[PDB]
């Protein structure tokens, strides 16, 4: 499992359940090509997006549908979504966890990178 | 100003000068049209991007070139950029401050919205 | 001012007014002595806490009453307060801004330090 | 396991290893009384601090020694430590995870609270 996503709710103090997540890779003509997708579990986690052989060097984008989450809770949001864009595997293959912390008018994101 | 951007360095506890910023709007055909651009000052702030009459209802994108900032200090960071996407002026005119806080492997972003 | 405090609400995207703030210093016998206090203004800022001559070398504590803010809005939050502890003026006089960003179950804090 | 602590490094993109952590409970005369302590693992986590029968209602403090971590890495820090103070079990017993994200001049903390 070379790529995982984990999401938390700063208003309720809980994992973020049933949030949609889409992954893209950058094409040669500089457009974004669809790569993988899913929804977060009861623990706020999304596993099994890709494999070691498929996840080659390149530039990748992860888009989290934060607007649809806040609307389901009846709370007004600022952002359309939360994004993360990064270059992968520049010094060999690694395991990547993308962690996000969500509020209606503010978010933070962090990468935890292992061998 | 109806739109201002402010940027800080979380390693050094200091404003970030000379950081490039590009703004886009979503057009009727669902493509991103260039709207405004500039660089941050000595205080880490960028003013004067637009006017109340130009800044109508719509979906806007703010892209901050964080990778060039870290590379000039000798560091290879995780992110290519930081990008903030939002609907503006839906309930009438407002003033927007977009703040960003930077680390080599993390960033946060906050919006302050006021009615004049 | 050599010391300023600024507070924001991450649910509403707005400055937080009327929030209580208390400052303490560490004395020679390792006990906390009261140093200064005040409340935030309409812009969410608190100025005028001390002077350059009073603000000597030492360890300082800034306590922000976040629980009273949330309770007045009908909310029972996780934290009792937010408390920031730091050594000041070790390498000569500097100016300090202590910022805090608030949610019911989370808070962040940042220091901006400048030389005049 | 009613109480757990998890810590991450925003400069290096890694869990925070071998950071000291102390826990206190508030006494009747308003002083802080020592309660438990330990160090973070290779995954940045600290388990086994207390039990369900010992962890009664009251006000608790968690202190993370962030200054000693940055000094070990040769990086100048702003804060003496990171603190978290909270009232526990007001509506019955819960499981609490205290999550912290660290930079030399800035930190964030969040509670994840389960049944």
SS3 annotation, chain B:
CCEEEEEEECCCCEECCCCEEEEEEECCCCCEEEEEEEECCCCCEECCCCCCCCCCCEEEEEEECHHHHHHCCCCCCCECCEEEEEEECECECCEEEEEEEEECCEEEEEEEEECC
Which residues are CB-neighbours of B74 under 8 A, at least 6 positions away? none
- Distance, in Å, from the CA atom of D67 to the CA atom of D64, rounded to the nearest integer, reads 9
**CATH number attached to the domain at D1-115:** 2.60.40.180
Place of tokens 């984008």: A61
Beta carbons of D76 and D70 less than 8 angstroms apart: yes
Residue C46 pairs in a beta bridge with C5
- Distance, in Å, from the CA atom of B101 to the CA atom of B11, rounded to the nearest integer, reads 10
Could you tell me how far CA D22 lies from the centroid of its own chain? 7
Q: How many angstroms separate the Cα of D32 from the Cα of each of B99, C114, D62?
A: 37, 35, 11
Chains that touch D (3 or more CB pairs under 8 A): A, B, C
Residue B43: count other Cβ atoms within 10 Å of its Cβ. Answer: 12
- Write down how long chain A is: 115
Beta carbons of C89 and C55 less than 8 angstroms apart: yes
- Distance, in Å, from the CA atom of D21 to the CA atom of D64, rounded to the nearest integer, reads 5
- Distance, in Å, from the CA atom of B51 to the CA atom of B2, rounded to the nearest integer, reads 7
- Distance, in Å, from the CA atom of C99 to the CA atom of C8, rounded to the nearest integer, reads 8
Q: What is the DSSP string of D20-84?
A: EEEEEEE-TTS-EEEEEEEE--TTSEE--S--TTT--SEEEEEEE-HHHHHHHTT---SBS-EEE
Q: Resolution for this model in angstroms, one decimal place?
A: 1.6
CA nearest to D96, candidates D81, D82, D113: D113
- Distance, in Å, from the CA atom of C71 to the CA atom of D14, rounded to the nearest integer, reads 36
- Distance, in Å, from the CA atom of A23 to the CA atom of A79, rounded to the nearest integer, reads 19
D1 CA to chain C: closest CA distance, Å? 19
- Map chain C to HEC letters: CCEEEEEEECCCCEECCCCEEEEEEECCCCCEEEEEEEECCCCCEECCCCCCCCCCCEEEEEEECHHHHHHCCCCCCCECCEEEEEEECECECCEEEEEEEEECCEEEEEEEEECC
CA nearest to D5, candidates D93, D96, D85: D96
Backbone angles phi, psi at C67, to 5 degrees: -65, -45
- Distance, in Å, from the CA atom of A99 to the CA atom of B15, rounded to the nearest integer, reads 25
- Distance, in Å, from the CA atom of D6 to the CA atom of D110, rounded to the nearest integer, reads 10
Q: Is A113 on the interface with D (CB under 8 A)?
A: yes
Place of tokens 């500089």: A30
Q: Is A87 on the interface with D (CB under 8 A)?
A: no
DSSP letter for A78, please. Answer: S
Beta carbons of B14 and C114 less than 8 angstroms apart: yes
Contacts of B104 in chain D (CB under 8 A): 10-13
Q: Is A108 on the interface with B (CB under 8 A)?
A: yes
Beta carbons of B40 and B21 less than 8 angstroms apart: yes
- Distance, in Å, from the CA atom of C50 to the CA atom of C36, rounded to the nearest integer, reads 7
* Contact call for C13 and B112, based on CB within 8 A: yes
Which residues are CB-neighbours of A109 under 8 A, at least 6 positions away? A82, A84, A98, A99, A100, A101, B106, B107, B108
Contacts of C79 in chain D (CB under 8 A): 84-86
Number of CB pairs, chain A paired with chain B, less than 8 A apart: 48
Beta carbons of B105 and A107 less than 8 angstroms apart: no
Q: How many angstroms separate the Cα of C111 from the Cα of each of D23, D94, D106?
A: 26, 33, 7
- Distance, in Å, from the CA atom of C105 to the CA atom of D4, rounded to the nearest integer, reads 16
Q: How many angstroms separate the Cα of B28 from the Cα of each of B25, B110, D28, D29, D48?
A: 10, 28, 66, 67, 58
- Distance, in Å, from the CA atom of A83 to the CA atom of C64, rounded to the nearest integer, reads 32
* Contact call for B110 and A110, based on CB within 8 A: no
Is residue B53 part of an annotated ligand binding site?
Answer: no
CA nearest to D75, candidates D11, D14, D6: D11
Token duo for residue D31: 């002083």
Beta carbons of B108 and C108 less than 8 angstroms apart: yes
Q: Is B79 on the interface with A (CB under 8 A)?
A: yes
Rg (C-alpha) for chain A, rounded Å, is: 14
Place of tokens 């990178």: A113
Residue C29: count other Cβ atoms within 10 Å of its Cβ. Answer: 6
CA nearest to C17, candidates C7, C27, C3: C7
Residue A53: count other Cβ atoms within 10 Å of its Cβ. Answer: 8
Which residue in B67, B79, B97, B98 has the most chain A C-beta atoms within 10 A of its own C-beta, making it the best mutation to test that interface? B79
Contacts of D10 in chain A (CB under 8 A): 110
Q: Long-range contacts: A91-99, Cβ < 8 Å, 24+?
A: A93/A2, A93/A52, A93/A55, A94/A2, A95/A1, A95/A2, A95/A3, A95/A4, A96/A2, A96/A3, A96/A4, A97/A4, A97/A5, A97/A6, A98/A3, A98/A4, A98/A5, A98/A6, A98/A62, A99/A6, A99/A7, A99/A8, A99/D8
Phi-psi region of A44 (alpha: psi -120 to 50; beta: other; left: phi over 0): left
Contacts of A87 in chain B (CB under 8 A): 80
Could you tell me how far CA A63 lies from the centroid of its own chain? 6
Q: Would the CA dihedral through C65, C69, C72, C74 be positive or negative?
A: negative
Beta carbons of A33 and A41 less than 8 angstroms apart: no
Q: Where in chain C are the domains? A: 1-116
Is residue D108 part of an annotated ligand binding site?
Answer: yes
CA-based end-to-end distance of chain C: 11
CA nearest to D109, candidates D18, D4, D6: D6
Q: What is the DSSP string of A31-76?
A: -EEEEEEEE--TTSEE--S--TTT--SEEEEEEE-HHHHHHHTT--
Residue D8: count other Cβ atoms within 10 Å of its Cβ. Answer: 22
CATH class of B1-116: mainly beta
Beta carbons of C105 and A10 less than 8 angstroms apart: yes
- Give the nearest partner residue to B81 out of A81, A85, A109, using CB atoms: A85
Which residues are CB-neighbours of D77 under 8 A, at least 6 positions away? D66, D67, D70, D71, D104, D105
Place of tokens 């990064």: A86
Beta carbons of B5 and B45 less than 8 angstroms apart: yes
């Amino acid at each position: 499992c070379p790529l995982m996503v984990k999401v938390l709710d700063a208003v309720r103090g809980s994992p973020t359940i049933n949030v949609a997540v889409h992954v893209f890779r950058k094409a040669a003509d500089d457009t974004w090509e669809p790569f993988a997708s899913g929804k977060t579990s009861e623990s706020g986690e999304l596993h099994g997006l890709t494999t070691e052989e498929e996840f080659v060097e390149g530039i990748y984008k992860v888009e989290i549908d934060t607007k649809s989450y806040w609307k389901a809770l009846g709370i007004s949001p600022f952002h359309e979504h939360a994004e993360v864009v990064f270059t992968a595997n520049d010094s060999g293959p690694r395991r990547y966890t993308i962690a996000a912390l969500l509020s209606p008018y503010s978010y933070s994101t962090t990468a935890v990178v292992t061998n």
